[PDB]
């Protein structure tokens, strides 16, 4: 008997969706996990001013390796062995 207007999810007069208990428990546990993450993310170690350049050498070496790997692009080698053994298609009982 009760008819819903155009699209029960978008528009003006829409079918309202409510909350039960599973969603509340999920929100509670997610908020607890996020508060635990906030607590564990409330303590540094080097206090910013003690890391002006501790692992920059590794980054520079990795960048040099990536550059050497990207600048070493060349077509593969071409040998005569393939062109010679391709003649074995018409091989008989030899």
């Amino acid at each position: 008997r009760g008819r819903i207007p155009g699209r029960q999810w978008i528009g003006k007069h829409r079918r309202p969706r409510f909350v039960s208990l599973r969603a509340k428990q999920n929100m509670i546990r997610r908020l607890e996990i996020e508060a635990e993450n906030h607590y564990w993310l409330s303590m540094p170690y080097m206090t910013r001013e003690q890391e002006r350049g501790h692992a920059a050498v590794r980054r520079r070496e990795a960048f040099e390796a990536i550059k050497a790997a990207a600048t070493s692009k060349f077509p593969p080698h071409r040998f005569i062995a393939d062109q010679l053994d391709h003649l074995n298609v018409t091989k008989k009982w030899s």
């Binding site: 003006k12 969706r17 969603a23 509340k24 929100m27």
Partner: peptide
Amino acid sequence: GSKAVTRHRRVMHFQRQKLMAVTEY
């Protein structure tokens, strides 16, 4: 699309409704 202030109450979003229902007095 409707404006921010209207007379028909305008039901909020699902996430906003869940947040308001889980954070009651």
